[PDB]
C-alpha cells in the first residue's frame with residue numbers, strides 16, 4: 001500500500017483513509033482543504049487522492065525549480081484526469097515529445113503581430129456587445145453577465161481562430177455556446193468525477209469503451225462543425241488571415257498534423273476562449289460593482305487614454321496601468337487554476353528535498369494568493385497592490401494566474417487583450433450596480449471548477 | 464446512493480462512509496463490531512458493507528421467522544461472497560431450486576443408520592490417533608492439536624465419504640491436508656477479500672477471468688483426486704458401503720448430477736469435515752485444559768459409561784449428557800459461524816417490521832451467545848448451563864451453533880459424533896495440561912475466520 005510514503009519521507013500531512021486517501025476532505029471544497037493544510041503544515045505537505053500521492057509545495061525557489069528549472073527533464077506533464085478518448089492529443093493533455101511538438105507548432109499563433117491583426121476583427125464584435133447591453137440597459141432588469149460575455153467570447157474566438165463569423169451575439173439560442181458549456185460538468189457531488197479521482201485504475205477500461213468525461217453528444221457537434229469548415233469551406237484561400245485553423249492546415253501539407261488531432265486542439269481553444277475568458281470578465285464586473293470607486297477610477301483612465309469613448313487599439317490597451325491592475329487583482333482573488341500540478345517523471349531531489357517517481361507535485365495557487373506572508377489583508381480586493389510602486393513586493397512564483405515555465409498558458413496575451421477590449425468598450429458606455437439577488441458576499445462553488453455558487457446578476461446603466 | 468436506506472426506514476446504525484460503508488469498523492474484528500452495535504442500538508440495526516445494506520436482528524421470533532418461517536419464500540440464500548468459479552454449484556453457495564434439488568439429494572447421507580455404519584469405520588482410525596499421541600506423550604513436548612486432529616478428521620471424512628483410505632494419520636507430509644488448508648486464506652489485512660466485501664461489483668468480471676477465492680492450485684489437486692477415484696477406481700462395486708461418492712454416482716445413472724458439480728460438493732464436504740471439525744476439537748481441548756475439574760468430570764463419565772477404556776458405540780455416545788454439555792458450551796463461546804446471514808429475495812414485513820428487497824439479514828450469533836439478557840456471566844465457560852435442569856432457560860433461536868431451518872448444517876449429526884468419538888478415545892487415554900506458550904487468555908484472530916491468534920499448544924499425559 002503506497003499510503004505510507006509521506007510518513008516514510010518525514011513529510012507531514014492529514015492521515016489517509018484506506019482506498020479513499022484524503023478525498024473526503026474535499027467535502028468543503030479543496031481550496032479550503034489547501035488553506036487549512038497550509039496553515040497547519042507549513043512550506044510543504046503530502047496527501048492522497050485515492051492511492052495517488054500529491055505533494056503540495058509553497059517555497060518560491062522550489063516552485064520555480066519545478067515549473068521552470070526542471071520542466072523538460074522531470075516535471076513535464078500534468079496528471080491524467082480520466083477517460084479522455086481522441087482528446088488525448090489535445091495539447092494541454094498531451095505528454096512529453098508529442099506535447100512539445102504541438103507546443104512548438106501552436107506557439108506562433110499569439111504573437112504581437114498576429115495579435116494586432118485581431119484588434120480590428122474584435123473591434124467589430126465589441127460594437128455588437130455594446131448594442132446588446134444597451135437593450136437591457138433600456139429595460140433595466142438584472143443581467144446574467146455570463147450570458148452576454150459568453151456569446152461575445154464565443155464570437156471572438158471563433159472568428160480569430162477559424163475565420164468563421166458564427167454571430168453568437170445576435171443569437172440567443174446558439175448551438176455553439178449551448179454545446180460548449182456542457183463539455184465539463186466537473187463536480188464531486190457528481191458521482192462520476194469523484195470516482196475517477198479516487199479510482200483512476202478504471203480509466204484504462206473506460207477508454208476501451210469510448211467513454212469520455214466529454215459528452216460525445218458535444219464532441220460530435222464540435223467535430224462536425226470543424227470537420228468541413230476546415231475543408232471544402234476554406235478552399236480558395238480568400239480573405240485568409242491569421243487563423244490557427246490555417247496554421248494547422250498550412251502545416252499539414254508540404255511533424256504532420258492528423259485530422260482528429262486537429263479537431264482536438266480546436267476544442268481546447270474554443271473552450272478556453274469561451275469559458276475561461278467569460279468567467280473572469282464576470283468576476284471583474286462583480287468586483288467593479290461591489291467597488292464603485294474602483295469602477296470610477298477605471299472609467300477615468302478609459303476616457304483619459306481614449307478621449308471621449310474613442311476606439312481602442314493594441315497600443316492603447318497596453319498603456320492602461322490601472323486596467324491591468326484591476327484584472328490582476330481579480331485574478332489574485334479568483335484564480336481559474338486554483339492549483340498548478342505536475343507529474344514527477346523520474347526521481348529528484350529539488351533544493352534539498354527528495355521526490356520519488358510517480359508523485360504529483362501541486363502548487364496551491366488559491367491558498368498562496370491569500371497568504372498573509374506575502375499579501376497585506378489578503379481577503380480584501382485591493383487593485384493598488386499591483387501598482388508600479390508596489391509590484392516588487394510581489395513574488396513572481398506566488399502570483400501565477402497563467403502558470404509559469406514552458407507549460408504556462410499559451411493564451412495569456414490573447415485573453416488579457418480580449419478581456420480588456422471587452423472591458424473598455426463596456427465601461428466606456430455603461431456602469432454596473434449591485435442587485436437585490438446579487439450574492440453578497442459571493443461564495444464560490446463547493447465542487448470542482450471555479451464558479452459562482454449563484455450566477456452573477458447586476459444592474460446596467462448607460463452614461 | 465443506497466446509503467440513506469436505514470435512516471429512511473427509521474432503523475438505527477453507525478454512520479456509513481461513502482464507498483466504504485462501515486467496513487472500517489471491522490478493524491477490531493467484526494465480532495466486536497457486532498457486540499458494540501448490539502449494546503448501543505438494541506434489538507435491531509443496520510450498517511453497510513460497501514454499498515451492501517446489512518440488517519442485524521436479535522428478536523427470537525424475528526430470527527425464527529427468517530430462518531424457518533419464510534426460508535422457502537423469502538430468505539433462501541446466503542450472500543454471494545466473491546469470485547467463485549465452478550464452485551457456484553456447491554450446495555452451500557447454490558441458490559433457490561438448484562440448491563433445493565442438491566439438498567434433497569444429499570439429505571439422506573447423514574441418517575442414524577448411515578451414521579451407525581461409520582461407527583466401526585472411524586473406530587479403526589481412533590486407534591491410529593491414540594497411537595500418534597502416545598508417541599508425543601512419551602516425548603513430553605508441546606503439541607499443536609490442530610495437526611493431530613487435522614489428519615484424524617481428514618482420514619475420517621475421506622473414508623466415510625468416498626471409501627478411500629488416504630491414511631493422513633500415518634502421513635505428516637500429506638498432500639490432502641496440506642492443500643485443503645490453503646483453500647480459504649480469509650483475512651481483511653489480506654487486501655483481496657477486503658476489496659470484494661467492499662466492492663462486489665468486480666465479482667462478475669473476476670468470474671470471466673477464471674479467478675476464484677480458491678487457489679486453483681488447490682482445486683486442481685482436489686479435482687484430479689476425486690476425478691478418477693470416483694470413476695475407474697470405484698467400478699466393480701466391491702465392499703461398497705454408505706459413501707456419498709456413490710450416492711452421487713448412483714443418482715447419476717438411471718435430477719441428473721453433473722461431473723464438475725460432483726467435485727464441487729465433495730470439496731465442501733472435505734473442507735467442512737477437516738477444518739471445522741478440527742478447529743472445534745482444538746477449542747474444547749483448550750477449555751478442558753484451562754479447566755481441569757471439567758476435564759476430570761468428563762473423564763469420569765467416559766469410564767462410567769465405557770467401563771475401563773471400553774470401545775465407544777453410537778448408542779454409547781448419545782447417552783453421555785456431560786460430554787454433550789461440554790461440546791455445546793465450547794460452541795457457545797466459539798461459534799464457527801459467528802454470524803448467520805440470508806439475502807432478502809423479495810419485499811417483506813416480518814413481525815411488524817419492513818425489509819426491502821436485496822437487503823442482507825444477519826443474525827449476530829457471536830454477540831447473542833455472549834448477551835447478559837440470556838446468559839449468566841456469559842464470559843465464563845460453564846458447561847452446567849446445558850444440563851437437563853437448565854436447558855429450558857435456553858432459547859433455541861439465540862443458541863444455534865448449526866444454524867436453523869431448512870438451510871441449517873447438514874453435517875450436524877456427523878460432526879457431533881465424529882468429534883465425540885475423537886474426544887472419548889483421547890480422554891480415555893490422555894489428560895491435557897497448559898503449556899508455557901499457551902496463550903492465556905486465548906485471543907481470537909482479528910480477521911475473518913474463527914481461529915486462534917496463536918496456534919494451540921498443550922502438554923499431553925497418559926493415565
Ligand SMILES: CC(C)c1nc(CN(C)C(=O)N[C@H](C(=O)N[C@@H](Cc2ccccc2)C[C@H](O)[C@H](Cc2ccccc2)NC(=O)OCc2cncs2)C(C)C)cs1
Pocket residue numbers: 049078081092093183184186197267268271272276336337338339340341409411448449
Ligand atoms: C483533484 C484534482 C484532479 C482536481 N483539480 C481541479 C481543478 N484544478 C486545480 C485542475 O487543475 N483541473 C484540471 C484542468 O482543467 N487542467 C487543465 C490545465 C489547467 C489547470 C488549471 C487551470 C487552467 C488550466 C488541462 C486539461 O487538459 C484541460 C481539460 C479540458 C479540456 C477541454 C475542455 C475543458 C477542460 N484542458 C484545458 O486546456 O482547459 C482549457 C483552458 C485553457 N486555459 C485555461 S483552462 C482537470 C483535472 C479538470 C478540480 S479537481
Ligand SMILES: CC(C)c1nc(CN(C)C(=O)N[C@H](C(=O)N[C@@H](Cc2ccccc2)C[C@H](O)[C@H](Cc2ccccc2)NC(=O)OCc2cncs2)C(C)C)cs1
Pocket residue numbers: 512541544555556646647649660730731734735739799800801802803804872874911912
Ligand atoms: C462480511 C462477511 C462477508 C463476512 N463473514 C465472515 C464469517 N461469516 C459470518 C460467514 O458467514 N462467512 C462465509 C461462509 O463461510 N459461509 C458458509 C456458510 C457458513 C457460515 C457460517 C458458519 C458456517 C457455515 C457458506 C459458503 O458457502 C462456504 C464457502 C466455502 C467453501 C469451501 C471451503 C471453504 C468455504 N462453504 C461452506 O459450506 O463451508 C464449509 C462448512 C460447513 N459447515 C460449516 S462451514 C463466507 C463469507 C466466507 C467473515 S467476513
Ligand code: HEM
Pocket residue numbers: 091092093103268269270272273276277280336337340341400401402403404406407408409410411412414415416
Ligand atoms: C483569463 C483567461 C485565462 C487564464 C487565467 C488561463 C490560465 C491558464 C493556466 C493557469 C494554465 C496552466 C498553466 C500551467 O499549468 O502552468 C493554462 C494553460 C493553457 N491555456 Fe490558458 N488561460 C486563459 C485563457 C486561455 C485562452 C484564451 C487560451 C487559448 C485559446 C488558452 C489556452 C491554454 C492552453 C493551450 C494551455 C495549456 C498549455 C500547455 O500545456 O502547453 N488559455 N491557462
Ligand code: HEM
Pocket residue numbers: 554555556566731732733735736739740743799800803804863864865866867869870871872873874875877878879
Ligand atoms: C462442529 C462442526 C460444524 C459446525 C459447527 C457447523 C456449522 C454450520 C453452520 C452454522 C452452517 C450454516 C447454517 C445456517 O446458515 O443456518 C453450516 C452449513 C453447512 N454445513 Fe456445517 N458445521 C459443521 C460441520 C460440518 C460437516 C462435518 C459437514 C459435512 C461434511 C458440514 C456441512 C455443511 C453444509 C453442506 C452446510 C450448508 C447447508 C446448506 O446450505 O444447505 N458441516 N454448518
